[PDB]
Amino acid sequence: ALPQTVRIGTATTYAPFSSKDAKGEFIGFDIDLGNEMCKRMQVKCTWVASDFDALIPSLKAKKIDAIISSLSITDKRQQEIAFSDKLYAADSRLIAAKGSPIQPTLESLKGKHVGVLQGSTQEAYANDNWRTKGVDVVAYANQDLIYSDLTAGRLDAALQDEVAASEGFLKQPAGKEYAFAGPSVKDKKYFGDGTGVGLRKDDTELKAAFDKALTELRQDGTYDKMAKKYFDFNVYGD
Ligand SMILES: NC(=[NH2+])NCCC[C@H](N)C(=O)O
Known part of the structure; x- marks a missing residue:
């Protein structure tokens, strides 16, 4: 039941996780992670730029389907939305x-x-x-x-x-x-405890799919290959 296109909101003024290159295209570790997860989920993904403080509202209004934007997994936010497993520490x-x-x-x-x-x-x-x-x-x-x-x-x-x-x-x-x-x-x-993909609470299938993609790209070493482009340390944490 995954949408044919997962719309992912991000706030593109937070290098090296999410920013714009010279063409205005989305670049950064968040983008690399999201694109790699989407590839493995076998869905298309469209990125949507937004002020950071608009992300959770847009998600709840169904204007986007997911948030990948260094979004910290906090107790307070989990009363509103759901999260994938940790993408990286913060x-x-x-x-x-x-x-x-x-x-x-x-x-x-x-x-x-x-x-x-x-x-x-x-x-x-x-x-x-x-x-x-x-x-x-x-x-x-x-x-x-x-x-x-x-x-x-x-x-x-x-x-x-x-x-x-x-x-x-x-x-x-x-x-x-x-x-x-x-x-x-x-x-x-x-x-909170690292960052994750922000999701609507009732999108359990979408969460499982992100979670599955994430574990697989971590397991086969893709996570670390992608991370080395930006970081000479363990960005994932514990
Ligand atoms: N792309 C961004 N501007 N991210 C800001 C994240 C800041 C902090 N981790 C939070 O979740 O509130």
Whole structure:
């Protein structure tokens, strides 16, 4: 009962997982994973670009059938939607100017301007722990605006997925004079357990098909072959 075309939403401003190349075509590990799973599921797949915070609403409105967009598997989201098995791990961490004393603490961030992606686990954490207590937490439509507001000095720091920041910004020319500010933020309730394909709860058959494809491409070594294009480490985690 799988649709002839699985529509997959993604927010294409989160390299190296999802972004656009020079032609405007979808590139990144999420795209590679989704395309490889779709190949093995024997379905066609059409990618649909969207602001990150629109993904879960579009899914619930059936405007898309799946979300592959570094979507963290959280307790809160599982009350709304279902997930495939984990695609890869995702920790959260702050970035700031090289030499910044900033730590992911209320004390260190008071009077600071901190960027977070609207609709993200990072916004949830920052709004609850930081924004209410005086920290200027600013929500953004997409992560590229955040990077730009950081390098323009409009933001003192930004919270996002650690691997995204590292490969998508810090190790790029634009992020040369920036670094991680403090260690990963550990809060399993807000940040969840890796990312997965977001799905409607009643699409059990579609979930089983994604799950089957994922295990097979991991088993035969395709996952690691695809991952090496982007990462010299175990992006999957535990
Ligand atoms: N393509 C993106 N913009 N992904 C943002 C993901 C951020 C975080 N992992 C979350 O699920 O909220």
